[PDB]
């Protein structure tokens, strides 16, 4: 119930590949940036998880 909510939240914010030459937030299947500043590129990393 509560975990579901958390996962939903993550879905739109946290689970997105976050580029590198750019820092554009994309989507978990990404292999490009869709930015003509980034030059599309193929430097996608995951967006990091929470840490205290």
């Amino acid at each position: 119930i509560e975990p579901s909510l958390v996962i939903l939240a993550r879905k739109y914010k946290c689970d997105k590949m976050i580029c590198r030459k750019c820092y554009a937030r994309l989507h978990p299947r990404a292999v490009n940036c869709r930015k003509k500043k980034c030059g599309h590129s193929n430097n996608l990393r995951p967006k990091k998880k929470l840490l205290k």
Partner: protein, 188 residues
């Protein structure tokens, strides 16, 4: 490039009636009436009878070819909406402040007072045709409903994006109203 496209067909149920004039359709169904324009080159968009609407493209580029399918999909969506409407269930969540949402169907608007302890009454008008209704399961959801998917989704988006603190860490909080079930359609 310039390969000659085939047709893209979309089925039409006997519940609805699809008009078309000057490359610009109009579905009419029990629920209401959606209208949409499509502007392209040599895109013959015709009716076979009252069972199939066809979209064509004589000598399409790859770009041109791509958009045909999109057009078809959009008309399918329209068809769907005007016979059995779209329903987006949105769940809202934050880990301390209870987010106070309340609908006003007179204004056709959702308003959110609390969400991060923000004393503003964050509101935005729903798009033309669509409405929300205050559905309860434990004070956790709001269910938007509509004919047009395009409008409905936009409405959802507006209240999603607004409902989010825009300062410091995005992972730490869960603040927002997010779309849970979007594939569901209102029952008839």
């Amino acid at each position: 490039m310039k390969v000659i496209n085939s047709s893209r067909k979309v089925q039409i149920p006997e519940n609805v009636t699809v008009d078309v004039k000057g490359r610009s359709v109009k579905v009419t169904g029990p629920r209401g009436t959606l209208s949409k324009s499509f502007d392209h080159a040599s895109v013959d968009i015709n009716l076979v009878g009252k069972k199939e609407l066809t979209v064509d493209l004589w000598f399409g580029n790859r770009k041109q070819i791509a958009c045909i399918k999109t057009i078809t999909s959009i008309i399918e969506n329209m068809i769907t909406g005007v016979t059995k409407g779209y329903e987006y269930k949105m769940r809202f969540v934050y880990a301390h402040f209870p987010i106070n949402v309340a609908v006003t169907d007179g204004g056709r608007v959702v308003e959110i007072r609390n969400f991060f302890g923000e004393k503003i009454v964050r509101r935005i008008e729903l798009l033309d045709g669509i409405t929300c209704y205050r559905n309860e399961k434990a004070k956790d959801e709001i269910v938007l409903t509509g004919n047009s998917l395009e409008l409905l989704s936009q409405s959802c988006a507006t209240i999603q994006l607004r409902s989010a603190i825009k300062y410091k860490d995005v992972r730490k909080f869960l603040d927002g109203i997010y779309v849970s079930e979007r594939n569901v359609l209102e029952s008839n």
